[PDB]
Design a protein around this nucleic acid. Structure first.
Lengths: 104, 50, 99, 50
RNA sequence: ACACAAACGGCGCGCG
DNA sequence: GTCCTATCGATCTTCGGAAGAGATTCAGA
DNA sequence: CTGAATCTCTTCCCGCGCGCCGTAGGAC
């Protein structure tokens, strides 16, 4: 009753297009000139974008179904991490061995 | 009685052993791969991890 | 009957895997159960993945994962690797016949 | 009391069962189970009491 | 042209 | 030496704690 | 459809002072 009465519609909940924060709000300070400080959100975006592109290639190539199926999950996994990075079975971490800070 | 003290020497050694374990993976594969008739130990083990 | 099966490993070190697995097979030599392990290439459909022509059994299954930095098979479950479709392989090999 | 709870009966079942728990959703194998079991508590490289 | 200046995230130790 | 380049994800020193309420779940009634 | 004995992601005073310290793999 609440859902229908609201302006929301459940199908929107499944993301198809994704927003990305304005860069200044996710600054990349030059900790030491070219050796910038780590900026997790950019890193997460980097992973997703690359994960997205690679899937695109196989879709272009029409890769065998099993591979793309796995890719789809791996894409979902990255997005999952991007949001929470810990609600999933395992948080992802860099060489510093600390869990990356998700958006939430 | 249930509790014991660790000092620098003890802790360091364990840390040192951990590094060898990471050597183990590298050396074993190299040894498995190596021809072994011209390879020499300095090739088989590299300092960086330890 | 032997069929191609899908495995994933570390990119770039894929190539090391490409030959090393054969070497491991020649060490333990349950080889006749194997076919070839192959990965196409471009000037790159599969940049960090593997194809395994083989009949799948535990002994071979563990042998494949023996080589480090190989994540494992893809399929319904780890112990149930999925084969690539016959039409897929026959199509893709032609897609590999051109490079 | 435990014997009533226990579903396993033979060493095969025990080795298989424990492996399964240690290796969730993974192919069992009798010698693999044994070797894994050995690693658990009967090899310095994975279990050691000073 | 009448104008900016040097921190992002962790760890340890202490402080009331 | 300088500088370029592609993923990033397994097995090793892991476990080092614990109150409180929504699933899912053990035993029949 | 009743029952506990099972089940896991929330939370863990407010501020301050130094010190250190941050992707991997390679044309040989």
């Amino acid at each position: 009753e609440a859902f229908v009465q609201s302006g929301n519609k459940p199908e929107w909940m499944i993301l198809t297009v994704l927003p990305v924060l304005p860069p200044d709000l996710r600054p990349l300070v030059p900790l030491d000139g070219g050796r910038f400080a780590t900026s997790d959100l950019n890193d997460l975006y980097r992973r997703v974008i690359n994960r997205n592109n690679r899937l695109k290639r196989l879709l272009d190539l029409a890769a065998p179904d099993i591979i793309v199926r796995n890719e789809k999950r791996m894409l979902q996994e990255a997005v999952d991490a991007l949001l929470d990075n810990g609600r999933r079975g395992r948080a992802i971490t860099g060489s510093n061995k600390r869990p990356l800070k998700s958006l939430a | 009685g249930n509790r014991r003290i660790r000092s620098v020497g003890e802790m360091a050694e364990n840390q040192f052993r951990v590094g060898l374990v990471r050597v183990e993976r590298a050396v074993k594969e190299r040894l498995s791969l190596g021809d072994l008739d011209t390879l020499m130990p300095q090739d088989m083990i590299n300092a960086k991890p330890i | 009957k032997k069929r191609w099966y899908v495995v994933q490993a570390f990119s770039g070190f894929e190539g090391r895997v490409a030959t090393s697995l054969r070497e491991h097979i020649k060490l333990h030599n349950m080889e006749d159960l194997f076919g070839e392990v192959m990965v196409p290439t471009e000037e790159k459909f599969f940049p960090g993945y593997v194809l395994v022509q083989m009949v799948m059994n535990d002994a071979s299954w563990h042998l494949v994962r023996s080589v480090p930095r190989v994540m494992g098979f893809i399929g319904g479950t780890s112990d149930r690797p999925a084969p690539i479709s016959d039409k897929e392989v026959d199509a893709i090999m032609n897609r590999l016949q051109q490079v | 009391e435990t014997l009533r709870v226990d579903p396993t009966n033979d060493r095969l079942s025990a080795l298989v069962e424990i492996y399964r728990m240690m290796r969730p959703g993974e192919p069992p194998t009798r010698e693999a189970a044994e070797s894994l079991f050995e690693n658990l508590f009967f090899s310095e490289d994975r279990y050691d009491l000073s």
